[PDB]
Structure formats: C-alpha cells, structure tokens
Amino acid sequence: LSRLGDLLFYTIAEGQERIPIHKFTTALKATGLQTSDPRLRDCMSEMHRVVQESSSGGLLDRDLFRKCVSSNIVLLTQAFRKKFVIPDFEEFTGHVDRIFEDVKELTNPDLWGVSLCTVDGQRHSVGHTKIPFCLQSCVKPLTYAISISTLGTDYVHKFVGKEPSGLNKLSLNEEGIPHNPMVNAGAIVVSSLIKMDCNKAEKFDFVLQYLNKMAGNEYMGFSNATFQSEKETGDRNYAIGYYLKEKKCFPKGVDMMAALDLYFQLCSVEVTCESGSVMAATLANGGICPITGESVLSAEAVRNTLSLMHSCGMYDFSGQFAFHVGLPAKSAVSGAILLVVPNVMGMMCLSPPLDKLGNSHRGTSFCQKLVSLFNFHNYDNLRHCARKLDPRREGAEIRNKTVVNLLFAAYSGDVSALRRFALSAMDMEQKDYDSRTALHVAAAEGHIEVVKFLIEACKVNPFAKDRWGNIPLDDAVQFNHLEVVKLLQDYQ
Amino acid sequence: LSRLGDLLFYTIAEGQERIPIHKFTTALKATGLQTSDPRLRDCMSEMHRVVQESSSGGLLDRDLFRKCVSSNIVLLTQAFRKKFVIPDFEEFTGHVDRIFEDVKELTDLWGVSLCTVDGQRHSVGHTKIPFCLQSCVKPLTYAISISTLGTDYVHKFVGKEPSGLNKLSLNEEGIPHNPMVNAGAIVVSSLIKMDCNKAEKFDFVLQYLNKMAGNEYMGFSNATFQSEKETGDRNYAIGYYLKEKKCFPKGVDMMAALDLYFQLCSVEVTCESGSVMAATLANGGICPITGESVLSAEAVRNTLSLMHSCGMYDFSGQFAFHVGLPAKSAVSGAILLVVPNVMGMMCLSPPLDKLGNSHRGTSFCQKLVSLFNFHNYDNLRHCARKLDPRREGAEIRNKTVVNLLFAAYSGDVSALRRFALSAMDMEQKDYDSRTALHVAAAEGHIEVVKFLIEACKVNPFAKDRWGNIPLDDAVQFNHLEVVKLLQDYQ
Amino acid sequence: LSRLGDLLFYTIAEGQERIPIHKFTTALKATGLQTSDPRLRDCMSEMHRVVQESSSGGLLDRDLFRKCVSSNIVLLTQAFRKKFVIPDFEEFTGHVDRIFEDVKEDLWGVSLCTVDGQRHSVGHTKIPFCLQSCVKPLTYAISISTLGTDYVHKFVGKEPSGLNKLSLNEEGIPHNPMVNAGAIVVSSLIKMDCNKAEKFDFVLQYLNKMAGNEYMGFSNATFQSEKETGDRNYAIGYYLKEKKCFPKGVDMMAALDLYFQLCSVEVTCESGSVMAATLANGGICPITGESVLSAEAVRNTLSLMHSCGMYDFSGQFAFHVGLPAKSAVSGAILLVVPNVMGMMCLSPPLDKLGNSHRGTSFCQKLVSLFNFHNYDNLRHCARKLDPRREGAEIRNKTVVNLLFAAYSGDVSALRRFALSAMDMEQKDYDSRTALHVAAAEGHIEVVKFLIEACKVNPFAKDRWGNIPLDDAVQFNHLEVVKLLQDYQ
Amino acid sequence: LSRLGDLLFYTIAEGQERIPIHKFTTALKATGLQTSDPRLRDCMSEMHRVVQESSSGGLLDRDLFRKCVSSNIVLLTQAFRKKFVIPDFEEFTGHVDRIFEDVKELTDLWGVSLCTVDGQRHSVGHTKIPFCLQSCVKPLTYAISISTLGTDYVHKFVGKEPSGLNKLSLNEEGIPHNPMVNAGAIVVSSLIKMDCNKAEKFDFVLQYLNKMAGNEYMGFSNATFQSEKETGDRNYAIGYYLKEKKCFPKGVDMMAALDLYFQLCSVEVTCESGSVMAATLANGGICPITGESVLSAEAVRNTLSLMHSCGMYDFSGQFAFHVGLPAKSAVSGAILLVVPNVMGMMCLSPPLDKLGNSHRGTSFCQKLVSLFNFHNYDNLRHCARKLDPRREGAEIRNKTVVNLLFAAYSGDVSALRRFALSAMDMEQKDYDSRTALHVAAAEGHIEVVKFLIEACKVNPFAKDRWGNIPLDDAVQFNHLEVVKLLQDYQ
C-alpha cells in the first residue's frame, strides 16, 4: 500500500531529500516527546543500525524510513500532524514556566520543582524534578485503584466508605466502616484486601507490579530509612489499626499488623517528579498508561479514584480545592502534590514547606495559578473560554473561526444570527485574512435592511481602513447602487 | 453559482423537484430543533405567508425553498451538517424512551425533559405538568448573586463546602455552610439588591429566571406562597438565628429577606422550562436556545461546583460517586441535572425516598450515566461499554478552510505542510473563490507561493466575482519577484 | 400540765423577774431570726398589746408568757435552745462577712436564708433584679409536682448537653429543663386550659409561697424587651414547633410569651435567698412552714440544678463547689446547700462563661471553708468548719473519749486516734491527758504505748501543778515508776 | 465504782446471774459487728482463753466480763448504746432480703454486701464468689493519685468533667475527659510513682487497696491479666494515641502504663472486700472496720464527685437522677455503691444491660434508694414515704455531759442555762467522780456556783477519786468569796 510515510518525511524535510537524524530529533522534542520515549522504541533502533550499511553513513533517505517504521506510524503521524491533546506545546510550557517562576517569592527551601505528563505521552519538567521523595500517603488512590479493579466495585466498598468525613478524627461512618480510602483508616483497610492469600513480600511486589506500569517504568524505589521510621513512629496508625481491629471491620481471616506493615511499605515507595508526573497521567487517560500504551487499571477503577481525590484528596482543604481549582489532587507531608487534569494531563510538584492543612504552600499556589489561566476546572465551559486559554485546541483556531462564521451571512439575509455574536460580547472589530468585516462584506451589496442593524445596534466604527485602503463608499459606486450611500454619510 | 448552501433541498428532497411542507417539519423535527424555536420564527412566519398566497400552494421548488430556509442557514446547516453536540439525536432519544419504561417496574406522574447546549429538546412523560421549584432555585438564586456582586463578596456571608452530619449549624467562620441548604439560601436571597421593595425584588430574580429559562413557561403560585408562610416553621427558626449572630449584611430585614426566599421557592415551571435553565448552566451562562449572556462565567462555575458537592443533601456524596453529574432535587419529586458542555435535564416523579430525593428520578439518572459516558470523571476515548453520542467519531476539530487562509496570512508554511499530509483539497472556496495562494501573493511570501504552486498543483486561472486577477493585486504591492515566478507557469 | 414556758423566760431573763420586751428583741436577733418573722406573727400583736395595758409600761413577767405565747413555743424554744441547724450564727455570719469583703480585692451583695428560717444579708441585697433563667428550676419544680414525674419528662429530658446549644436528645426531646429549649417546653405544660394572664399568676402563686410572700415583682421593661430581642427563643420556639415536640393541642407563641413573663419577674437578694431555701428544704418554706412543692419535685430540681444549672462551670462547679446552683446574665447566682441553707448573690460583672465573677468566686471561698460540698464527709471535717454543730463540740467530745478510753485500758482505741492524725496532746477542761488517766489506774500496757508510739511530752502540768510521778506517791504503785523514769 | 460495763451484762443477760456463750454470739451478731472484726479480736481471744483454760468454761461472771471487755468497751458500748449510724440494723437488713428476693425474678450469680461507716457488715446471696475489678479500680486508682500527688498535678493530665461523647477524644486542652473512662484511667495509672519497676508499681497500688479494703480477701487473677493483654485491642488503640499527643508525663512509656492498668483491672475481690473499699470512700478516706487513714480528704471528695457524674458509663445521667448515689459498674456484672456518711455497698450479677450495667443489680439499687432516703437530694426530716434508718428522727446533737464540764470551765453560764431548760440533771459524772461544780469550783466563777447550787440543788460535798474536797482547792486558791457561799448550806 502507498503508505503516507513519505508524506511524513516531506513535512520533516523542508529542503533536499537527504536529512540528518539529528534534525529529526529536533522537531520531535518540539512536540514535547523525549528521544528516550518508550512509544517509539522500535523506531530509533533501526535508525542507529543504518550507520554502517548505508554508504553515506548517516544520511537517511525516503525509502529507508518506510521500512523501519511499522503499524505504529499512526502514533508517529499524530505527533507531527499536531493531533495530540496539547498542540503549541512550546508556548504552553513557557506559560507553565512563568507560573513556576512567579511563585518563587511565596515562602531545604531551594527544593522547588514541577513535572507534567500529557495523556498523549507529551511531557515537560522544570525545577528540581529528579530529587526522589516518598509517596507519603499519595499512594492511597493508587492502592485503592489497584484493589477496586482486581476485586470488584462492591467488594472494596463493603469495607470502606465512598464519601468524606468532614472533620485524624479516628471514627467510622454510619454503616460501620471507614469513611473513605483517602484517610488512614480507609487506606489501611483497602491495603488489607489486596492479595489476601499471599505473604508480605509477595503482596508488596504485586502492588508494586501495578506501579511501574502506572508510572511507565520510570524510577520507583522502596526506601528503607522511611520504612524503619514510621514503624517506630507509626503510633497514629497503630492506634487506627488496633481500633479497626477492635471494631472488627477487617475482612474475615486477615492479620492486622501484617496489613499495617504493607501499608508502611507503600508509603515508603520513593519516586521523582518526572516519574510522579507520568503517574496519574494514566489516571487522566482512564486506566491506560500514556507513555507506553499499557492498560493498567480498569475503567471503573480510574473513575472511582478520581471522584475520591475530588472529595477527600486534599484533607481539610479539599472543599476549597474542589471550588477554586476543581481538579483531583492528593497531597503529602513531604511537600509534594499529585494533580490530575482529566483528559488532558497529569502533574506532580515538589516544595518542602507545608501549610497548616497538610498541603504544600508553593504546590497549592501553583495549582491555583494554573487552573486560573488554562480552563482546566471541571465545570469551566469548554466553548466559552473567556480570558482562559484552552490548550486542547491550537492557538487562534477559535478566534479565527468565529470571524469566518460571522462574515458568512451576507446575501441570504441571516439578520438574527448577528445578534448572538454581538450579544455574547464577541469583538466585532476583528479583521479577517483579507481585512474584510461583516460591515464591509454586507456594505458591498448595499441592501440597507442588513447593515441597518450593525450601525444602529453595534455602533461599530465604519472608518476602518482595509488593506487596499478603499472605503465601502467606493465599493457601492463600483456596484451601481446609490440608495445605501445616503446612510453612509451619517454618523458624523 | 450552486454551492454547499443549496444541498439543504437535495438532502431533504432526495433530489425530488418538489416537496411537501410537512416533510421539512418532520425532517427538522429530527436533529432536535422544534418548530417554535426562538431562533426559527422567521422561517415559520415566512413559510406560511408566501405558501398560502403563492399560486404554487403546497409545493416547494428550489428557488422557493432556498428563500424560506434562508433566514436560519447557520442553524439549519449546523442541524443538517450534524454539527450539533449530539448528532445522533434521533437514536439518542430512542434510548431515553426504553430506559423511561424500564424505571416503571422499579419504585403515576413521571416525566423527563432534556435540552442540549445547542438547543436540541426532547421530552417524554408528563413533562408539561407545572410544579414548584421548591429547592431548585437555590443554585439559580446563588448564580444571580455571583454575577452582579462577585464570588468574594457573596461568600463573605456564606461558605462554599458541604455541611455533612441539621439546621442552625454554622462553619468555623461564623457563616452558613453553603448556599445549597435552607440556611444558606436565605442569606444569598437577602444579598440581592437590598435597596428596593420586596415585589420589585422578586421580579428582578424572576427576570433572570426567564432569561436563564429562555422565555418558556413560568408561574408564581400563590397557593404555595401563603401555604408555606403559614407553615415555614423550620425556615422561620433558621431566619431568627441568622439575625442573632449578625449573619445578614448591614441594613437587612430578616422578615423581608426571608419572604423573598419564599417567593422564589413558589415559582412554578415545567420540565421543559427547567431543562433550559439547566442547559443554561451547562452552556457556561448562555441560554442554549436564545443566545444571551444571562450569567457570568465565574457564576456558573461556582454554581456547578457546589451543585456537585452539596446538591442532593445526604445523598450528595453517593450521587457524586455513582453519577457524578451536578444535580438538585426537591420534595415535589423533580431532579434538576446539568451535564457540563453537553446538555441539561429535569425530571419529575412525586414519590420520594427516605433521604428526600425522588426515586424514579435518581433511578433514571443512575441508569442514564451508566450508559452514556456522562460521569464527570468517566473518560473520553476509552468509553468502555458506555455509548458516547457526543460525536459519531473522527474529530469535530478536523480540517477547515479557515486555518489555511489565516496560515497564509501569517506565513506559517509549516501548518500548510501539516495540512498537506491529510490529503487536503485546496479547491474548497469561500466568498473569495481563491485558495491560500492569493493571500501569500498579496503578502509576497516567496516560500509560500512556491510551495503551493508546485506541491499542490493549484489552478492559477481561478476566477473571482470581484474581478481582479491575482497578478493585478501583487502589482500594486510591488511584488516584482512574485510576478516572475507566477508568470513562469505559462 | 406544767408546761415549760416559764423555763424559756428564765434563760431569756438572767436577772430580775420582770424583763422589758426590748430585751426580748435582742437575743432573738442574735439567733438570726428577724422580728418580722411570719412564724411569730401572733406573738408580735400580743406582745405590743400588753406593753401599754400593763401598769409597768413594757415589763414582761412569767405569768404573761403562758397566755400570749402559743403553739409557736416549740419553735420559740428551738431558737434559744440552739436546736436550729446553724448555732453560733453571730460567728458564722462574721465569716460570711469575711468572705464577702475579701473577694472585693459597684453593685455587690449576698443574702442567705437557713432551712430553719434563720437568715442574714450583707451588701446591696435590697436592689431588685430580674430572675433571668433562675426561674427554670422553679417552673420545672412547679410543673413536676402538679403533673407527675413521668408526664413532664415525656417532653423534656433529664440529661446535660455538654456543648446556642441548639439540638435535641436521642429520644426527640430537649436535653433538660435548664436550657432554653427545655425551659420553654416545661412552661407549656402548666395549666393547659388557661390564658396568658391566668397561667402567669398561677405560676406566680407558687413563687410567692416559694419565697414566703416576700417581694415578687413582675417588671414590664424587661417583658417588652426580650420579645423584640427574643430571636434566640423565637428560633428555639419555632424549632420546637417544627420538631413537633410540644404537647397535643398547645399553642407555641403563647407558651413562649408566658416564658418571657417569668424571666422578667423581679426579686431582691433577700427575697431570692428565702427562695432556694424552700427547695433546700423538701418543698416546705422555712419562713412560713407551708408545703410549697412536692417531695419528688425538689429532688428532681436539685439533681438537674447540679448537673446543668451553671452553664460552662457546670462540670467544674460540681467538682470544686459541688452545690446545686443556677446563674443569670443579670450577674446573680442562686445557691442551695441542701439541709443547711438557701442563698443568693449579686454582682453585675459577668465572666466569659455566662456566670458572675464575684458570685462564683464567693461560692468557691464559701464551700472551701464550711464543709458544704456534697461529698465532703460530715464526721471528718479536716480543716473545714461545720456550722451544723456548734464550736468546740466535736473537739471537746474527742478529748473525753480519748481520756475515757484510757480509763478503760482501751489500748486498741488509742491506736485509732493517733493513726488518724489526731493530736494526742489535747488538754481537757482540767488539763488531764490519757497518760494521766492511765497513770491513775496503773494500766502498764497503756502507758507504754503512749510513750513509744505517741511520743507524748511528759512536761504537761495540770491546774494543781501535779506531775504523773507525783500521783504515784498518792497511790504507792512501784512498777510504772521505773517505766516513767525512762524516756529522759 | 459502778463502771458502765456492768450494764452491758445486765442488758444481754436480762439480769440473769449467768450467761451462756451462744447467747452472746447472736447478741453481738445483732448491731452488725462480726466476730472476726479486727477491733474485737482482743475480746474474742480473751473470751476463748478463759473458756478453754478454766473450770467455769463457757460462762461469764460480772468481774470476768468487765476485765475481758475492758480493752474494747468504747466500740462495744457504741454497738450496745445503738450509737451506730444504723441502730436498727437487725430490721434494716430485714428489708434488704425481701427486696433481694423481689429483684430475683428478672433476666445465676446474684449477691449483695454492705458495710456501714461504723463497721456494720451484712451480706446475702453469692457474695463470697470472687470476681475481677474490671472497671471498679478506676476510682480507687484515681484516689491514690490525688493523695500523694495532689488535685492540681493529677488533673493537668486529665480533665475533671464528664464527656458524653468508646470515643477516643480529648475535652478541650489535649488531655482525656475524666479519670473514669478507659482513656483517663490509663493516664492516672501512669502518674503513680514513675520511678520504679512495673512489679513494685502494682504492689504499691495493691497495698493501698488492701488498706482501703481493710485486709479482707484479694486476688491477682493472671488468667485475666494475660487474656486482656492478648485481647485489649481498645486499650492498645487508646494507649498509642496518648503518646502521639504527648498526653503522658515526661519520662513515661505507654508499654508500662497498659501493663499496670491491666494488672489493676485484674485484681480480684468479693462483695465483702469491695464493699469496705466503698465504705472507705463513705468515711472520707478512713477504713470503717479498721480505722486507718488510707486516703486524704480531698482525694475521696474528688473521687465521689467524679463517680457521681461519670461512674456509670452512659446510664450515669439517668442514674444520678433516679438514684443519685455515686456508683461504678463493670462488665463482670458488679456495681459498686457509695452512700456518703452512711455506708458502702457492692453488688454482683453477671447479665448486663445495653449500656454495660447489670440488669438485676441496677434494679436493686433503684429499689433501694426509693425506700431508704439515701438519694443525694432526698431531704432529712421530711422523709415523705421513705424509711430513714440513719437516726429514726432523733437529734444527733443531743445533750451530753461533756458540754457541761467545758461550759463550766469557760464560765459560759448561758450554755448552762440552755441545758437547764431541758430539765436535765447536772449530777451526770465522768470517771473522775466530778460534776460541773468541781470544774467551776476550781476556776472560782462566782456566778456559776450560785447558779449550780440553787438552780439544781446539787450536793457540794460529794466525794472524789482525787481525794480533795473542792472547798480545799478554793482555800488553796484563796477564793474567800466562794467559801462563805458554800458554807451557807450548812
């Protein structure tokens, strides 16, 4: 079949047929795809092989490119066709950069970093993003997602609730189970449901097996210093664990200290921001890892977890986060916040300083400045973006589209449609590709019934100069009609 | 001369030379839009006037058909291009009737209505029966307050988080928990323009509700206005407590403010009018069917966030999990529901459950979101077993002629190269009857014109109604270099 | 029938056989009874009649007593016989005066009425003040007696709240009559078929007998107020209306209105002190002896007044003071010392917990010095004084048993005194000790224990100058002399 | 001289010259005191010593009776003068057995024991069966802490007021609610001498409980000490939380604390031994039957105030109202009762109520207080329908010979005049063969002598043991005025 691989090369090769692979590496990082991306592992392999077989020793041509690429071409076109979920990435990251650099004033204070992974695998990172940190209680949804997928939607919720507590605060819901999996009592109970017929060592690696697919096989360590600690200092969880033992809310035939010990292992799992960003991007992508395409979690599992981060993710501040930011998140005592922008991207941030409610100061400030500028809120309308940008669509696409539809209804007499653009505060002064406007477009025919609304209602300035410098008065003379001309002399 | 405008006759007529009028109404009935649509009255009036007077009588020819449908081509092409949010409306509602009969088995007055953000309406069951907005005006009242006053001012007198486990409870700030309970509904109702009498105050809010509703039916039932003022024991109890704590603003009478909340609760609507108000919240503060900016952007966002969390009283938490759509219920048996960026809905079933929410309504909503991929945190792309009627497929952001002409204006050849990969045809013409070539020729971009003539094999002999050859336009701009290259083609 | 009336005159008249009645007034105020006492009403009319008729012009002899004095003799002897519940009253009030003046370091007063009718007042006790929420126990007592214990508590609880405070108990009724919700409900249980004017006087009828017909005013300025400002109670009343916790066929606005009348009832400290002495007694007023309240009405009111009476000191007051009390925003506290006395205090300055500063400080200093706490042991008073018994009563009694046990050779009993921290160096009327008693009888085992265990000082000198060694010469016993010679 | 001990023979013997021993056993059994009473052992030994080593055997003559009882007359006379707090003991317990049978029809271990503050003991039912003080040691532990440490120190680490909210929490200051719930019981156990090992810690408290009990039976059941350490999930949950919040003092570990608290909870007593510990709280920190100052005055006051409100778990509010006595219950089925200044009591019945109190034991307490005036706010004098065996009406402050002698010493004639009003004879005498006149004669008060000689006609020449006529003392003191007045009689 005459596959479009040659067409891909033509877009890449603006000039001669012989292009270096070094030039192919750039314009692939422009789309925010790293050279080391797993999704294109089978592509870069043959590119390095050709250094010896080819006489030119590096200068790729059109024919050789087709053979190396394969059924994965569909993903390869999408990157250069700008059909990912965030085109104009170079500008998008630049705005993520200015937000990041702005909050430096807001007070290891030097530790300050944020990373992000788009649902299409596109990614960017700024600041100290490669300093590992523990997922201190950030693994509660990860554990809950693993349990709910493998066991069933009802089984996991016979033993823990699905709605917040409203007040730490060791207590149970009305039914006799912990309020939600986002608190210690629920996180401990759900942790005890995973692989109940296995030992401590085997259970931990099975859960950790689900990680590194959630994380796309970036770094995932199991630190011991945090594991030895928090077992001597885990009095809060010992109190919860014994309380949960007393209230008999564990499953039948389950050890309690063993369940606690596994829970302490998970909290000690150490990740960087880059690996953290790729994590929860699989949550955005509905249980399928973006950076590799592996189906990690079930469809319901990623639905249930995201609703719970919205409710209980940020502890006491969850109510305000659900209002000012309206994104699922999960915070840690380490000073790092997990963030999910469903259908768009996943993001993780790091700043050690922490505010009174268990959340980072810079981290929460960053999430606020972000949603305020990029239409990310859950109930922000996608069509009427207002001053907020929509990275889901390439820049100026909506701005140019509105003009073309506005100018379209010249001669058929669609008077009514003009009202909605005007009454929606849409600017009538926008100039199209040829410097035309609905006033210029309609003023050519000289039928007063249409242009009458524009002057009377919109009060639009008719003194604008087109690219040719001609005024509609000359156009009317060019079309042999004088009646409309009388109205034109008015307004001054 | 003939172009995409004309196909409206061909697609409806199947090429038939003359069509009956009832075909157009039946065809237009599909795709959702109703004959009485505020944006289609021109066609209805223009249809009856000429047809009954013209000698042609009950037959529509091409010239006759074009002018009658000429008034609303932007909507009619949108409806017939299937550019609406739900282009499978004939079958999307076909699902809704089977679910409607399904909830009958579980448990006389049962009706549901819907209205998409593009104005597509459907209704089944007793949807015309009026009923009182007992509690559904709480978001609507709160939305009005945000727009004129603001979120910072409105929330000094009320919180923004669920209360949980129940009156006479306040947050740590000394204000009611949120505007979605009786306590918070009173305080926001008091905030609305405390400088005019009660009667004018009611009509101000009633004016918004009609604009939010888009001028469909509304009522002000006095048989519930008085029957509550003589029975609102809990409301009176709440009101007295608020003024003790100085919760109301300065210079506000509790009895007047507490009477206004009673006036609004007594407003009467149907499923049809209510669904449009819901669809006004889905559409970001613009009526789907009349296109006015009734509300501010920040108002509807705050309204939906609180409707999601605090909407359904005690069942709010479970509803945000199984269904995840902002909603609001009332003792009358009606559930308001908002699907952001998609549609709005309203149900009605007088029987209720122990938690104060309608059983058929909540049964219907659960059976809906489980099938149509509408949950807030359900994902696009990976629909799983759920149907996704928001798009037949491909992309709603596919190739268009607009990006070319502005790409030519800006000199972004790379975008043109990206468009070239999609086997895009350059022959699609707007008013210009010109491809991207002229704009680059006018600008003088040397690389763009060379790319277009060679890479795409564009016709240089394209005519235009304005009567100027592309070479002539370049002459005024002194693009001498462009002249030589273009002339070399022949 | 040789009645003991003439014996009363002899103790009253230490001198000649004809005494002026002016001297009878004094020594009747020393016992803390006022000349205006209702119990001796008939006496006052009779005494003044013969002051003018008698040729002596006031002098009173024995023969008059047997005729004019009457059934009130049994009470009249009780005052001079010191058989009331608080003898040595002149010293007792001096300490209450001491506490009063001490807490000072402009309106400040306290009054007290003993359960036997005895009474004292100091400060600004005569300035009237409203009875704001101090009527809550009084209305509950009136309601609980007339209706029944089961009826009144179908509609209000008997439990505290420990938390304004708008909520109901688990059963669906307000927690207790000591809160506004419970206080308003009990108000609605009184005289179902009567009107606002008739109900209020029937309740006020009880209050007048409660106070022994002392001043009972119904101010209007506070009644007009608290109906405009009663939003808290309107909120409660409508709340109680909504919850349907009122009795069948009862209007809510009227029940609220009656409640506002009671709070506006105005009393002085003197009148308020006689109040809380009726229910210090078992529903019998001391100053009149009339049965005001039922037996199982003062038991319930005091139990609830202890639990819930004070507002936020309730837990601490039941610990540091342990007395039923009720406080008001006016700055006045009602006190009950069951079986002892009633009491009321006044100081406007009110602390952050809704209770008076000087008032609560006074109750602290009082109970700390006078054995009034509920679980203070009566027999082992420690450093706390006991007004129930006259001074030097137990102290002298312990000496006699300590010295008498020595005579019997009761060595075992002597262990209890010493090991109970009691001072064994106590001197009797004639300066003897147990060592002296044992020395006389020659109980060798007794004297040995005192020297070894008690370490008694042998330097004690009797009034005659005799030393225990000298008594040996009187009776000529040798064996104990050798033991006595030791220890020095 | 005629010592009062002879009257004890006459009243027991009814004037009979010779008494059998078995008569005395029943006679002393009445008035409450048991043969094994620590304060009556000397009489019992001397009673048995002569009987088994004399020809007379089991018979007591007057001289034999006087010398044997001489060591214990002050308590034996108290028992036979009916000076005990319950002089009607033979019938007071006769009531207790009928109530005992009446409650013994509800739904078997059922036993009750009592001990008065004067050491009168009675028991009925299975009172000898031991059981563990599961929760009843909470007041006892708290009392020990107050005495050595103080109320200010002990309550820095625990509040002093109930909770009403089983519920791991803290009142308002980062400390447990009260020492009567499991959370507060643990903190006080940690406060007791945190400078020595666990085992010595247990025996220090056990030493107090022996003295509070007065040396009756106690046990240390290890089958409950271990069975709670391997099952005390609630206690471990509470303990872990306390150290997180730094509620324990400095230099304390939760490991030791729960070990001690389970040791104390596992101490074993019977109804008899427990009742005396209760009666030790009645008598203000002194054992009734042995007279040791085990506790401080402020310790038992604080203990009883907290036992009143917090003693029962959730039935306490309804218990402080219907019964009003300080009490304490345990899962074993035993209720500890303290009737201040009267007696202590302990019950035992395994089956419980919904709130963890014994059904057959709690009904008995209500049926008791309803009949015997013991409610904290029942009134003396006006007993209503309730029996009052405390003093059956009489004045405890009745006239005595002691007041005359000390009144004579101080010269307060008015007190003597008050005594004279009662027609009482001033010839009542102490051991020393001296009436009030001798004391007055020694002092030389002129007015007192005139009152005594005439108001009562008392002999002034009565002989005395000390062997000197009072006139001779006056002659020694040169009270010439007294001489002539005294001589005027002859």
Author numbering:
A (entry chain B): 69 to 175, 190 to 249, 252 to 576
B (entry chain C), D (entry chain D): 69 to 175, 192 to 249, 252 to 576
C (entry chain A): 69 to 173, 192 to 249, 252 to 576
Pull verbatim passages from the article behind this deposition.
All glutaminase enzymes share a catalytic domain containing identical active site residues and a conserved mechanism for hydrolyzing glutamine to glutamate. Filament formation guides an ‘activation loop’ to assume a specific conformation that works together with a ‘lid’ to close over the active site and position glutamine for nucleophilic attack by an essential serine.
Several high-resolution X-ray structures for KGA and GAC have been reported; however, thus far, there has not been a structural determination for the full-length apo-GLS2 protein. In addition, residues Tyr182-Lys188 in GLS2, which correspond to a loop in KGA and GAC forming a ‘lid’ that needs to close over bound substrates for catalysis to occur, are also flexible like the activation loops in the GLS2 structure. The C-terminal region of GLS2 contains an ankyrin repeat motif consisting of three pairs of helical bundles located on the distal ends of the tetramer, which is absent in GAC. Interestingly, the ankyrin repeats asymmetrically occupy the area between the N-terminus of adjacent monomeric units within a dimer, showing a preferential association for one monomer over the other. However, within the GLS2 structure, the ankyrin repeats appear to hinder this movement and thereby may prevent the activation loops from adopting the positions necessary for maximal catalytic capability.
